[PDB]
């Protein structure tokens, strides 16, 4: 399928364990989607003061589309010294790996695979 239904957890940047994907833009969009495969990715919602708390190259969520069964469309955006790989929409947020944190709430997603 082009498109997967997914319910992200949603983090507190405080919470967050491990802080990124890895160290280029290549390994952290392979590894998002692997674990937003695997159900082990989470997202953090971007306010003041996230995003210098997480590790770049950063991925972000961001809006495909104007909602199947709830679920936003949305693609995956990396960005490493203030440059993106990617063009989207308004970020829900940066994704980073879940390792049983306990996350604040769920976004429904429909992630373009």
Do not use: N, W
């Not at 490493?80 to 996350?103: A, D, K, M, N, W």
Request: with cysteine; hydrophobic share 40%; proline share 5%.
């Amino acid at each position: 399928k082009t498109h997967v239904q997914l319910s992200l957890p949603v983090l507190q940047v405080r919470d967050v364990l491990v802080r990124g994907f890895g160290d280029s833009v290549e390994e952290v969009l392979s590894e998002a989607r692997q674990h937003l495969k695997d159900g082990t990715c989470g997202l953090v919602e971007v306010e003041k003061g996230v995003l210098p708390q997480l590790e770049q190259p950063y991925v972000f969520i961001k809006r495909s589309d104007a909602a199947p069964h709830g679920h936003v469309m949305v693609e995956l955006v990396a960005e490493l010294e203030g440059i993106q790989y990617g063009r989207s929409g308004e970020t829900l947020g940066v994704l980073v790996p879940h390792v049983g944190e306990i996350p604040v709430a769920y976004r429904k997603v429909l992630l373009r695979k």
